[PDB]
Amino acid sequence: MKNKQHVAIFPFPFGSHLPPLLNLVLKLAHIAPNTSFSFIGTHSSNAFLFTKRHIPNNIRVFTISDGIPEGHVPANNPIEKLDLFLSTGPDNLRKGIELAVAETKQSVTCIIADAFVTSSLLVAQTLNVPWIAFWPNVSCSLSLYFNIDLIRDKCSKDAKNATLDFLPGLSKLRVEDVPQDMLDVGEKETLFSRTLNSLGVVLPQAKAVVVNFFAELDPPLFVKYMRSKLQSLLYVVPLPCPQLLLPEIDSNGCLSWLDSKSSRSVAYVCFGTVVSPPPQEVVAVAEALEESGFPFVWALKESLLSILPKGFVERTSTRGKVVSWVPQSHVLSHGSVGVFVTHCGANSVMESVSNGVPMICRPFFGDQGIAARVIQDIWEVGVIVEGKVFTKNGFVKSLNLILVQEDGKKIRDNALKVKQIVQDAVGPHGQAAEDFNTLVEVISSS
Predict the structure, then answer these.
(1) Residues 442/208, Cβ–Cβ less than 8 Å
(2) What is the biggest distance separating any 2 CA atoms in the chain, rounded to whole angstroms?
(3) Which class would CATH give 1-248+425-444?
(4) Can you tell me which residues bind UDP (predicted)?
(5) 17 given a catalytic annotation
(6) Separation of alpha carbons 381 and 349, rounded Å
(7) For 249-424, which CATH class?
(8) Is 54 among the catalytic positions?
(9) What is the Cα–Cα distance from 293 to 319, expressed in whole angstroms?
(10) Which residues contribute to the annotated binding site for UDP?
(11) Residues spanned by CATH 3.40.50.2000 within the chain?
(12) Annotated catalytic residue within 6, 72, 83, 114
């Protein structure tokens, strides 16, 4: 019989959502070389993933609209292009299906989609195929979407530090951690917030939900809770397969610079590429770094250099590196790094915990506030920056607590314990190993 299995894949076609889904598809395509995988992005998301990359012969790339009519210029905020894509609806997705079917000469038999592309559920339903939802965001934020009314009621009535005890396994989460998007009602709602708020009703319709994380690190009662909501909850290890990686010239010599530093002594600072911190927090971070005296590597956008204090880069040049880009996975895996100062993006958090690097957290948007709370209060591998915003004095105190002080010993020790839990989770008898196989068979069986 000819194998006619044909998986269509819909990334949420933006930045940090793209590599984790490519990573999972590369793994699936490698273990099932007789199965077609059709990866359907926009022109910009496709350029972002596939420009310098070799892809296996069973992965084909197709292009659909980004929802930005020619001549339109989106404003400079992170939501507009999300809305415009989401506004293209299931018919734009079915244009992708059409291209995939025409090329492969195979009907689609299964859809994997980033959970935010909720219109692809409608597409799966039309085709009568299983819909597999992929979750690359903070694992614990799944629970919020089944409890919006309780959460909204609490956030409006109770104190900012009040705990969300109604979420099993997540009683350490607080009102102040809740993503603002899920609270906005009226003019402030966006298509993007409305899409996320539909997840409580969308996700139970998935044949499975695949979480991009380590089951062993999520609170076991939260896992049990989500299992009770979903048809199937599968964890697949987020670590990159060899095929995901594209070698890089470390143009800044970070690694060799790090080699000259002592164990767990260096602060690595990065706000990721979607956040622009308020200018005064950028100044704060620089003042704190200089005054701390600690060695540091700060991956900082070029356009932000002109707002650094006059002479800061120069005065700190003999102990600090301020650079536009670093090989972050290699930096975080370097034994000289003693703390990661982070906005708590999901990939950055995954890299930090898997490498035993404790964190100082300043969440900026979306569900980063959930991740920050998990880090400080559940895993206890870090602290939210004293003050909740970067200030010179508060950040100097957090730096000191984690890098040097006895009071930070527990956190440093917990970071090592969690590294060891991750090493054991990615092992061959990890349950993620079983879950990956389960996912493979769903696709086999489709």
Answers:
(1) yes
(2) 71
(3) alpha beta
(4) 16, 273, 325-326, 328, 343, 347-348, 351
(5) yes
(6) 11
(7) alpha beta
(8) no
(9) 8
(10) 16, 273, 325-326, 328, 343, 347-348, 351
(11) 1-248+425-444, 249-424
(12) 114
